[PDB]
Design a protein around this nucleic acid. Sequence first.
RNA 1: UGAAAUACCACCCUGGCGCGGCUGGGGGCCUAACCCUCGGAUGGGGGGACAGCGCUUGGCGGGCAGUUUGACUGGGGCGGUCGCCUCCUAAAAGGUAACGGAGGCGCCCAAAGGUCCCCUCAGGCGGGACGGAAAUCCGCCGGAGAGCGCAAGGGUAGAAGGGGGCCUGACUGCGAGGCCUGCAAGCCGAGCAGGGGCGAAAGCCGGGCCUAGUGAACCGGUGGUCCCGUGUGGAAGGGCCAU
RNA 2: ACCCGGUGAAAUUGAACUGGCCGUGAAGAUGCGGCCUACCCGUGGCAGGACGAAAAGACCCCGUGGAGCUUUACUGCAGCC
RNA 3: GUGGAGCCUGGGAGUGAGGGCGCGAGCGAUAACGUCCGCGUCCGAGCGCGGGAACAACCGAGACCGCCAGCUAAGGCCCCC
RNA 4: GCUGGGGCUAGGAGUGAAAAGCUAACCGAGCCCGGAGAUAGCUGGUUCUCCCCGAAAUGACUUUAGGGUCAGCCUCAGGCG
RNA 5: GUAGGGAAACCGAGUCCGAACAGGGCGCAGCGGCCGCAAAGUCCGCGGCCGUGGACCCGAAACCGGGC
RNA 6: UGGUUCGUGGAGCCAUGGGGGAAUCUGGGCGGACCACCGCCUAAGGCUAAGUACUCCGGGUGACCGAUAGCGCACCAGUAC
RNA 7: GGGGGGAACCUGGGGAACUGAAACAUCUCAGUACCCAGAGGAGAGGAAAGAGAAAUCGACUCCCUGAGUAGCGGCGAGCGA
Lengths: 53, 64
Amino acid sequence: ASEVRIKLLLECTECKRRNYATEKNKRNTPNKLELRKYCPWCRKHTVHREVKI
Amino acid sequence: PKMKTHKGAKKRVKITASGKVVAMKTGKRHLNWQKSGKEIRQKGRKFVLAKPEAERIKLLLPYE
RNA sequence: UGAAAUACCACCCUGGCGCGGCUGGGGGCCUAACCCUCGGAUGGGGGGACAGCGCUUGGCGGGCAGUUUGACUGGGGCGGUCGCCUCCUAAAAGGUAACGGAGGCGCCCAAAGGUCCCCUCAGGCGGGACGGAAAUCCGCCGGAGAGCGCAAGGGUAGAAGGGGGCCUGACUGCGAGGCCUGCAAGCCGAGCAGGGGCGAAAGCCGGGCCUAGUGAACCGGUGGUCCCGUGUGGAAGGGCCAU
RNA sequence: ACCCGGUGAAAUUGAACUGGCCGUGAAGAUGCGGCCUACCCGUGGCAGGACGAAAAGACCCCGUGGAGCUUUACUGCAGCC
RNA sequence: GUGGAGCCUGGGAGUGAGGGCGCGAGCGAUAACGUCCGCGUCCGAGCGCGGGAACAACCGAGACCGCCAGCUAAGGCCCCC
RNA sequence: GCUGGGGCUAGGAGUGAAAAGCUAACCGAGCCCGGAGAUAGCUGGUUCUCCCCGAAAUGACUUUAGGGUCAGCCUCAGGCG
RNA sequence: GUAGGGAAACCGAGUCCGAACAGGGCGCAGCGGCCGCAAAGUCCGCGGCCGUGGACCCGAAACCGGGC
RNA sequence: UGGUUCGUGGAGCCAUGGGGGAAUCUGGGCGGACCACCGCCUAAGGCUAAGUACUCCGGGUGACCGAUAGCGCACCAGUAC
RNA sequence: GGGGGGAACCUGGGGAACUGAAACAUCUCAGUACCCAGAGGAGAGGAAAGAGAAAUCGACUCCCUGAGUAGCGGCGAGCGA
Ligand SMILES: [Mg+2]
Ligand SMILES: [Mg+2]
Ligand SMILES: [Mg+2]
Ligand SMILES: [Mg+2]
Ligand SMILES: [Mg+2]
Ligand SMILES: [Mg+2]
Ligand SMILES: [Mg+2]
Ligand SMILES: [Mg+2]
Ligand SMILES: [Mg+2]
Ligand SMILES: [Mg+2]
Ligand SMILES: [Mg+2]
Ligand SMILES: [Mg+2]
Ligand SMILES: [Mg+2]
Ligand SMILES: [Mg+2]
Ligand SMILES: [Mg+2]
Ligand SMILES: [Mg+2]
Ligand SMILES: [Mg+2]
Ligand SMILES: [Mg+2]
Ligand SMILES: [Mg+2]
Ligand SMILES: [Mg+2]
Ligand SMILES: [Mg+2]
Ligand SMILES: [Mg+2]
Ligand SMILES: [Mg+2]
Ligand SMILES: [Mg+2]
Ligand SMILES: [Mg+2]
Ligand SMILES: [Mg+2]
Ligand SMILES: [Mg+2]
Ligand SMILES: [Mg+2]
Ligand SMILES: [Mg+2]
Ligand SMILES: [Mg+2]
Ligand SMILES: [Mg+2]
Ligand SMILES: [Mg+2]
Ligand SMILES: [Mg+2]
Ligand SMILES: [Mg+2]
Ligand SMILES: [Mg+2]
Ligand SMILES: [Mg+2]
Ligand SMILES: [Mg+2]
Ligand SMILES: [Mg+2]
Ligand SMILES: [Mg+2]
Ligand SMILES: [Mg+2]
Ligand SMILES: [Mg+2]
Ligand SMILES: [Mg+2]
Ligand SMILES: [Mg+2]
Ligand SMILES: [Mg+2]
Ligand SMILES: [Mg+2]
Ligand SMILES: [Mg+2]
Ligand SMILES: [Mg+2]
Ligand SMILES: [Mg+2]
Ligand SMILES: [Mg+2]
Ligand SMILES: [Mg+2]
Ligand SMILES: [Mg+2]
Ligand SMILES: [Mg+2]
Ligand SMILES: [Mg+2]
Ligand SMILES: [Mg+2]
Ligand SMILES: [Mg+2]
Ligand SMILES: [Mg+2]
Ligand SMILES: [Mg+2]
Ligand SMILES: [Mg+2]
Ligand SMILES: [Mg+2]
Ligand SMILES: [Mg+2]
Ligand SMILES: [Mg+2]
Ligand SMILES: [Mg+2]
Ligand SMILES: [Mg+2]
Ligand SMILES: [Mg+2]
Ligand SMILES: [Mg+2]
Ligand SMILES: [Mg+2]
Ligand SMILES: [Mg+2]
Ligand SMILES: [Mg+2]
Ligand SMILES: [Mg+2]
Ligand SMILES: [Mg+2]
Ligand SMILES: [Mg+2]
Ligand SMILES: [Mg+2]
Ligand SMILES: [Mg+2]
Ligand SMILES: [Mg+2]
Ligand SMILES: [Mg+2]
Ligand SMILES: [Mg+2]
Ligand SMILES: [Mg+2]
Ligand SMILES: [Mg+2]
Ligand SMILES: [Mg+2]
Ligand SMILES: [Mg+2]
Ligand SMILES: [Mg+2]
Ligand SMILES: [Mg+2]
Ligand SMILES: [Mg+2]
Ligand SMILES: [Mg+2]
Ligand SMILES: [Mg+2]
Ligand SMILES: [Mg+2]
Ligand SMILES: [Mg+2]
Ligand SMILES: [Mg+2]
Ligand SMILES: [Mg+2]
Ligand SMILES: [Mg+2]
Ligand SMILES: [Mg+2]
Ligand SMILES: [Mg+2]
Ligand SMILES: [Mg+2]
Ligand SMILES: [Mg+2]
Ligand SMILES: [Mg+2]
Ligand SMILES: [Mg+2]
Ligand SMILES: [Mg+2]
Ligand SMILES: [Mg+2]
Ligand SMILES: [Mg+2]
Ligand SMILES: [Mg+2]
Ligand SMILES: [Mg+2]
Ligand SMILES: [Mg+2]
Ligand SMILES: [Mg+2]
Ligand SMILES: [Mg+2]
Ligand SMILES: [Mg+2]
Ligand SMILES: [Mg+2]
Ligand SMILES: [Mg+2]
Ligand SMILES: [Mg+2]
Ligand SMILES: [Mg+2]
Ligand SMILES: [Mg+2]
Ligand SMILES: [Mg+2]
Ligand SMILES: [Mg+2]
Ligand SMILES: [Mg+2]
Ligand SMILES: [Mg+2]
Ligand SMILES: [Mg+2]
Ligand SMILES: [Mg+2]
Ligand SMILES: [Mg+2]
Ligand SMILES: [Mg+2]
Ligand SMILES: [Mg+2]
Ligand SMILES: [Mg+2]
Ligand SMILES: [Mg+2]
Ligand SMILES: [Mg+2]
Ligand SMILES: [Mg+2]
Ligand SMILES: [Mg+2]
Ligand SMILES: [Mg+2]
Ligand SMILES: [Mg+2]
Ligand SMILES: [Mg+2]
Ligand SMILES: [Mg+2]
Ligand SMILES: [Mg+2]
Ligand SMILES: [Mg+2]
Ligand SMILES: [Mg+2]
Ligand SMILES: [Mg+2]
Ligand SMILES: [Mg+2]
Ligand SMILES: [Mg+2]
Ligand SMILES: [Mg+2]
Ligand SMILES: [Mg+2]
Ligand SMILES: [Mg+2]
Ligand SMILES: [Mg+2]
Ligand SMILES: [Mg+2]
Ligand SMILES: [Mg+2]
Ligand SMILES: [Mg+2]
Ligand SMILES: [Mg+2]
Ligand SMILES: [Mg+2]
Ligand SMILES: [Mg+2]
Ligand SMILES: [Mg+2]
Ligand SMILES: [Mg+2]
Ligand SMILES: [Mg+2]
Ligand SMILES: [Mg+2]
Ligand SMILES: [Mg+2]
Ligand SMILES: [Mg+2]
Ligand SMILES: [Mg+2]
Ligand SMILES: [Mg+2]
Ligand SMILES: [Mg+2]
Ligand SMILES: [Mg+2]
Ligand SMILES: [Mg+2]
Ligand SMILES: [Mg+2]
Ligand SMILES: [Mg+2]
Ligand SMILES: [Mg+2]
Ligand SMILES: [Mg+2]
Ligand SMILES: [Mg+2]
Ligand SMILES: [Mg+2]
Ligand SMILES: [Mg+2]
Ligand SMILES: [Mg+2]
Ligand SMILES: [Mg+2]
Ligand SMILES: [Mg+2]
Ligand SMILES: [Mg+2]
Ligand SMILES: [Mg+2]
Ligand SMILES: [Mg+2]
Ligand SMILES: [Mg+2]
Ligand SMILES: [Mg+2]
Ligand SMILES: [Mg+2]
Ligand SMILES: [Mg+2]
Ligand SMILES: [Mg+2]
Ligand SMILES: [Mg+2]
Ligand SMILES: [Mg+2]
Ligand SMILES: [Mg+2]
Ligand SMILES: [Mg+2]
Ligand SMILES: [Mg+2]
Ligand SMILES: [Mg+2]
Ligand SMILES: [Mg+2]
Ligand SMILES: [Mg+2]
Ligand SMILES: [Mg+2]
Ligand SMILES: [Mg+2]
Ligand SMILES: [Mg+2]
Ligand SMILES: [Mg+2]
Ligand SMILES: [Mg+2]
Ligand SMILES: [Mg+2]
Ligand SMILES: [Mg+2]
Ligand SMILES: [Mg+2]
Ligand SMILES: [Mg+2]
Ligand SMILES: [Mg+2]
Ligand SMILES: [Mg+2]
Ligand SMILES: [Mg+2]
Ligand SMILES: [Mg+2]
Ligand SMILES: [Mg+2]
Ligand SMILES: [Mg+2]
Ligand SMILES: [Mg+2]
Ligand SMILES: [Mg+2]
Ligand SMILES: [Mg+2]
Ligand SMILES: [Mg+2]
Ligand SMILES: [Mg+2]
Ligand SMILES: [Mg+2]
Ligand SMILES: [Mg+2]
Ligand SMILES: [Mg+2]
Ligand SMILES: [Mg+2]
Ligand SMILES: [Mg+2]
Ligand SMILES: [Mg+2]
Ligand SMILES: [Mg+2]
Ligand SMILES: [Mg+2]
Ligand SMILES: [Mg+2]
Ligand SMILES: [Mg+2]
Ligand SMILES: [Mg+2]
Ligand SMILES: [Mg+2]
Ligand SMILES: [Mg+2]
Ligand SMILES: [Mg+2]
Ligand SMILES: [Mg+2]
Ligand SMILES: [Mg+2]
Ligand SMILES: [Mg+2]
Ligand SMILES: [Mg+2]
Ligand SMILES: [Mg+2]
Ligand SMILES: [Mg+2]
Ligand SMILES: [Mg+2]
Ligand SMILES: [Mg+2]
Ligand SMILES: [Mg+2]
Ligand SMILES: [Mg+2]
Ligand SMILES: [Mg+2]
Ligand SMILES: [Mg+2]
Ligand SMILES: [Mg+2]
Ligand SMILES: [Mg+2]
Ligand SMILES: [Mg+2]
Ligand SMILES: [Mg+2]
Ligand SMILES: [Mg+2]
Ligand SMILES: [Mg+2]
Ligand SMILES: [Mg+2]
Ligand SMILES: [Mg+2]
Ligand SMILES: [Mg+2]
Ligand SMILES: [Mg+2]
Ligand SMILES: [Mg+2]
Ligand SMILES: [Mg+2]
Ligand SMILES: [Mg+2]
Ligand SMILES: [Mg+2]
Ligand SMILES: [Mg+2]
Ligand SMILES: [Zn+2]
C-alpha cells in the first residue's frame, strides 16, 4: 500500500453492498476494477465494481 | 469498604457458567484490507483466556 | 402575425429613480448618561456617547504557574542502537548471549493470481550480411552452475522456470486436527455447505516457490444491518457486520 | 607543657588476654598459616598503622526523587490588544 | 525402574545482582580473580567435617543425637604431626 | 559619613551601590501550626521453640534494566496410580 | 443459589454465528436397605492470601493552606 | 459556568453571571436533544415540631491502661524550660 | 435590639496541595484541609411547577436495602446515583 498502490472496496453491482476489500496499482490499472465475486446477500455470483475506500 | 467492579473488564469480557473467561479475538479493528477471509472470519469469534490471565480478570468481577 | 399579437383593467417580473418606513456602515455636530474639574455644586467649565466598567469572540503573552525532557550502554555522556526477515556464531533435535561477524524489510503484482495445454536453461565450441565479448539464426556438447520481482537461505526443470487459452477461489459460511508459545499473537490446515473458475476427466482453486513488506487497545470516519430507542410513536444517539 | 594540693570534662567506645616478617585471606591481617620476636605495669614524648575520629561522599552514577533558573519544549494564567 | 518419582486441580511463596571450576565457542591480546552464551558441577544455602601450610566453590565426603570402640576416602607414614 | 530614639515595607513577597546578598546564629524561596501517618519501586529494622520439605539469581514483555506481570524452579491440600 | 446462550431483540436445556436441519463456541447430568446417608447451594465460626485504607515499622528532600 | 452518576456527550433537569424578554389556567414548568400523543405538577413570598449529628458537661459500664502505660499532666501542667 | 464567647456537631460564602493515575496536563486526592460569616441546643431540609411508568406514589429529615447496580471515566486510575 502506497499513494500509487491504493486500497479499495468491491461493491456488488446488484445490491450495492460492499463485500470485499483489496488493492490495485492505479498507475498500472487506472480503470475501475470489475470482478465477479460471490455476494453473500444475493447468494449468487455478481460483478462487483471498485468503489472508494 | 466493599470491592468495586472493574468496568474495563466488564466491558470486554464474560465469565461463562463454568467459570471460564471469554473475550473477542484481537486484530480486526483496522488494517484489514489485506487480511485473508480466514483471518477476518476466525477473528470474529470469541476465545477462552488462558487460565493465569482469567484468574486475574475474575477477581476484578466480584459480583458477576 | 409570432412560441405568446395588440385598444382597456388588475396581479406581479426586470432594472432604475423620488417621498417614506426600518435598519448596516461611514463624516459632521449636539448634551444629558459616563469621566475630569471649578472657594461657588438641582450649578458652571472640559471631554463625551468616546473612554471606563459588565458579559462574550479571537489574538499576543517565561511577567507567572504546573510539568515533560525514554532505554540499552564493559561507569555516564558523546556516537551507535531500539520492530521485522536471512546467514553464521549455535557445541549434527528445538532453543541459546555480547555495543559479536555479514546483509536485507517498512514494498510489490489485475498478473507476478486460479486452472488447462504446451515448452526447457546458463554456458562452451563451430558456423552466419550490416553485427561487436555480448542483439538475432543454425548445428553439436551441455542435470542444472540459468531462472524463480527485490536480501540471504532452503527449495526447484519428473518445475516453483518460459509461452498461450479460458478466467477472478486475491471466495462467502465454517472448520477436525496440529505447529509454535509465559500471555496476547503468529502459523499450517483436511473436510462439509453455498455459489463459482478451469479441465474430457482424475482433479485442482479460500492469492503469489517459501520464509520480511508490519502495529494491540482506546477515540473517531464511511457502507451496510434494522438489534436498542429513557411514558408511547418516531427521531437523536448507540450496538452488530465491513472497511 | 612537667611535679605536688584543690575541682574535674570531651568526642570515641562489639568485646579484647590488641607484637614483626613472609604468605594467605573479599585483592593492604594484632585476630588465619609458617616462622621470628617478646618477663609484669606505668610516666614523658613522636605520629607510621589500627584502611584512626568527625559528617548515612558534596564528585560519579542510579531513582519514571526534589528544588532554582532558561527558552522559538508543552499546556495554562495574569496582563495587553 | 515404587521414587521426598510422575500427573491433574487448587492454597502460599520466594527468585527474576549470581559466582568459581571443567569442557565447547564468541568478544578480548591463542590478556585479566575480564566479558558473553552453551553442557555440567560445586559455592550460594554445606564459611559443617578430612586433605590441600593457611584459603566459598581443587581433591575426599552430603553433619539426627551420644561413645576414652572398629574400617576406610582423599592425603599421608624422618621430627614439628 | 557614623549613630540614638520613633516608624513603614515579608515569603514567589519584601529589601538589595547586585553577593541569588539579607528578611531573628544554616535563605536558589523564612518560621510556626495544619493537610500529615504526604510520598520513598530506596536504606535500615522486624522479637519464643521444635519438626518435615526446600528454591532462584533464567525466559518473555515492561519510560524496563537494583522495580514488576506471566512462565520456570519450592511448598502444602485433594485426586490419579 | 435454583438456567444458560446472545451486543441486543429474543429464544431456552439450549443458544449464538449461519441460508443450513453443516460444523463449531459457550451451556445442559449420588449410594445403600420411601427413608437414612452423602450432596447443589447457603449461613456462621476459624485460618491462609488478595482489594480498599497510613496497611509491617521508622526516615526524606519537597508541595500546599492559614497564621507569626 | 455550576450542581447531578453525567468530564460536551444525543445533554435533558436544577441553579445563574451576560443579552434579549412573555403570559394569568384557553396560563405555565416536567417526563433526558427534538416533534406529536398521553400523563404528572403548579416556579419566580415566608414559616413549620419529631425521627438525625456532636460531647465542654454529669452518670453508668468495660475479655480498656496501670506511672516509659493511660490524656501532654494520677503529683500545684499547658506549668518548669 | 445588636456587638463578644462556646469542645466538637451544622449551614452558608470562599477553597488548596502532597498524593493516585507507578511520568503528567484532563481526571484524582475533594468541595477534603483550611479561612470566613452565621446558627442553635441542634443545624439543614420540608408540605411538589416532586418522582417517573407503577393505569402508580404522595412534605422533609434519618437508618437499612436497592448497589458498587444504573451510569460516569485521558471508557485510564478511578468516580458512583
Ligand atoms: Mg472501560
Ligand atoms: Mg478485534
Ligand atoms: Mg469494526
Ligand atoms: Mg469501527
Ligand atoms: Mg498478501
Ligand atoms: Mg481470503
Ligand atoms: Mg478479503
Ligand atoms: Mg463474518
Ligand atoms: Mg448482585
Ligand atoms: Mg447469577
Ligand atoms: Mg464635539
Ligand atoms: Mg458641553
Ligand atoms: Mg458636560
Ligand atoms: Mg471638544
Ligand atoms: Mg464603549
Ligand atoms: Mg460574542
Ligand atoms: Mg480570552
Ligand atoms: Mg511560552
Ligand atoms: Mg517555568
Ligand atoms: Mg503535582
Ligand atoms: Mg513524556
Ligand atoms: Mg517529553
Ligand atoms: Mg519521556
Ligand atoms: Mg540510562
Ligand atoms: Mg562506556
Ligand atoms: Mg557489556
Ligand atoms: Mg570498565
Ligand atoms: Mg562494568
Ligand atoms: Mg545519545
Ligand atoms: Mg542455531
Ligand atoms: Mg544452528
Ligand atoms: Mg540447532
Ligand atoms: Mg546441539
Ligand atoms: Mg518446540
Ligand atoms: Mg548497540
Ligand atoms: Mg496472462
Ligand atoms: Mg547456447
Ligand atoms: Mg558465434
Ligand atoms: Mg560480421
Ligand atoms: Mg555473434
Ligand atoms: Mg539457481
Ligand atoms: Mg536486491
Ligand atoms: Mg502459466
Ligand atoms: Mg495463465
Ligand atoms: Mg465462462
Ligand atoms: Mg486446533
Ligand atoms: Mg499460543
Ligand atoms: Mg511474526
Ligand atoms: Mg501479520
Ligand atoms: Mg464446492
Ligand atoms: Mg461446484
Ligand atoms: Mg466445481
Ligand atoms: Mg466443462
Ligand atoms: Mg467439480
Ligand atoms: Mg479448501
Ligand atoms: Mg510471484
Ligand atoms: Mg506463479
Ligand atoms: Mg510475499
Ligand atoms: Mg488497534
Ligand atoms: Mg486510553
Ligand atoms: Mg465506537
Ligand atoms: Mg447505524
Ligand atoms: Mg425498534
Ligand atoms: Mg420513547
Ligand atoms: Mg404519528
Ligand atoms: Mg416501536
Ligand atoms: Mg423515520
Ligand atoms: Mg440508527
Ligand atoms: Mg470488521
Ligand atoms: Mg613527684
Ligand atoms: Mg593535679
Ligand atoms: Mg579479653
Ligand atoms: Mg600482650
Ligand atoms: Mg593472593
Ligand atoms: Mg598481608
Ligand atoms: Mg600477631
Ligand atoms: Mg585466635
Ligand atoms: Mg584457620
Ligand atoms: Mg595466627
Ligand atoms: Mg600472625
Ligand atoms: Mg601461629
Ligand atoms: Mg621477628
Ligand atoms: Mg604513652
Ligand atoms: Mg599514629
Ligand atoms: Mg599522621
Ligand atoms: Mg600530638
Ligand atoms: Mg591494626
Ligand atoms: Mg593512620
Ligand atoms: Mg589512615
Ligand atoms: Mg567511623
Ligand atoms: Mg539518612
Ligand atoms: Mg550515601
Ligand atoms: Mg552520595
Ligand atoms: Mg572532585
Ligand atoms: Mg552535580
Ligand atoms: Mg559513578
Ligand atoms: Mg538525577
Ligand atoms: Mg521518565
Ligand atoms: Mg524507572
Ligand atoms: Mg521527576
Ligand atoms: Mg521542579
Ligand atoms: Mg517551589
Ligand atoms: Mg504594558
Ligand atoms: Mg524431593
Ligand atoms: Mg520436588
Ligand atoms: Mg506416591
Ligand atoms: Mg501463607
Ligand atoms: Mg498454605
Ligand atoms: Mg525477586
Ligand atoms: Mg515475585
Ligand atoms: Mg530484573
Ligand atoms: Mg539478571
Ligand atoms: Mg551480578
Ligand atoms: Mg550467567
Ligand atoms: Mg569455566
Ligand atoms: Mg582435563
Ligand atoms: Mg572454555
Ligand atoms: Mg560463539
Ligand atoms: Mg604473549
Ligand atoms: Mg567473572
Ligand atoms: Mg578465564
Ligand atoms: Mg575466557
Ligand atoms: Mg556455572
Ligand atoms: Mg543471596
Ligand atoms: Mg563442598
Ligand atoms: Mg548443595
Ligand atoms: Mg566447603
Ligand atoms: Mg568456607
Ligand atoms: Mg576448619
Ligand atoms: Mg577445606
Ligand atoms: Mg585445610
Ligand atoms: Mg593442615
Ligand atoms: Mg579453601
Ligand atoms: Mg576463592
Ligand atoms: Mg544426612
Ligand atoms: Mg586401619
Ligand atoms: Mg591413598
Ligand atoms: Mg608433609
Ligand atoms: Mg610420629
Ligand atoms: Mg536612626
Ligand atoms: Mg531606626
Ligand atoms: Mg525602633
Ligand atoms: Mg519599602
Ligand atoms: Mg515588611
Ligand atoms: Mg507577616
Ligand atoms: Mg516562600
Ligand atoms: Mg508560605
Ligand atoms: Mg519563578
Ligand atoms: Mg520578587
Ligand atoms: Mg547598601
Ligand atoms: Mg526564629
Ligand atoms: Mg541569618
Ligand atoms: Mg546567612
Ligand atoms: Mg528548606
Ligand atoms: Mg522552593
Ligand atoms: Mg514554594
Ligand atoms: Mg533566618
Ligand atoms: Mg494552625
Ligand atoms: Mg492526605
Ligand atoms: Mg514522612
Ligand atoms: Mg512522589
Ligand atoms: Mg515485625
Ligand atoms: Mg533435605
Ligand atoms: Mg533474567
Ligand atoms: Mg508481554
Ligand atoms: Mg519496550
Ligand atoms: Mg528489553
Ligand atoms: Mg534506567
Ligand atoms: Mg546498567
Ligand atoms: Mg526501581
Ligand atoms: Mg509467579
Ligand atoms: Mg516439578
Ligand atoms: Mg502450586
Ligand atoms: Mg497430596
Ligand atoms: Mg448471557
Ligand atoms: Mg451447539
Ligand atoms: Mg445476525
Ligand atoms: Mg460441550
Ligand atoms: Mg445432609
Ligand atoms: Mg455446608
Ligand atoms: Mg491471594
Ligand atoms: Mg489511610
Ligand atoms: Mg497501617
Ligand atoms: Mg495488609
Ligand atoms: Mg507541586
Ligand atoms: Mg512544584
Ligand atoms: Mg506551586
Ligand atoms: Mg502565607
Ligand atoms: Mg445555560
Ligand atoms: Mg460539571
Ligand atoms: Mg458520552
Ligand atoms: Mg447534563
Ligand atoms: Mg454540564
Ligand atoms: Mg434555566
Ligand atoms: Mg440571570
Ligand atoms: Mg393547563
Ligand atoms: Mg400555554
Ligand atoms: Mg423550568
Ligand atoms: Mg422538555
Ligand atoms: Mg416529570
Ligand atoms: Mg421522553
Ligand atoms: Mg411532575
Ligand atoms: Mg403560583
Ligand atoms: Mg427554612
Ligand atoms: Mg411534637
Ligand atoms: Mg428543631
Ligand atoms: Mg430534629
Ligand atoms: Mg446522643
Ligand atoms: Mg464522661
Ligand atoms: Mg493490666
Ligand atoms: Mg488492675
Ligand atoms: Mg512515673
Ligand atoms: Mg506519663
Ligand atoms: Mg513502677
Ligand atoms: Mg486530665
Ligand atoms: Mg508524657
Ligand atoms: Mg508526667
Ligand atoms: Mg510542676
Ligand atoms: Mg461579627
Ligand atoms: Mg459566634
Ligand atoms: Mg453568638
Ligand atoms: Mg460550602
Ligand atoms: Mg455571606
Ligand atoms: Mg465553593
Ligand atoms: Mg465550607
Ligand atoms: Mg488559591
Ligand atoms: Mg495535582
Ligand atoms: Mg497522599
Ligand atoms: Mg492506587
Ligand atoms: Mg490515596
Ligand atoms: Mg504520580
Ligand atoms: Mg507513582
Ligand atoms: Mg514526577
Ligand atoms: Mg497530579
Ligand atoms: Mg471534586
Ligand atoms: Mg475538620
Ligand atoms: Mg434533640
Ligand atoms: Mg430551622
Ligand atoms: Mg404550597
Ligand atoms: Mg440486586
Ligand atoms: Mg467527586
Ligand atoms: Mg445510598
Ligand atoms: Zn449483492
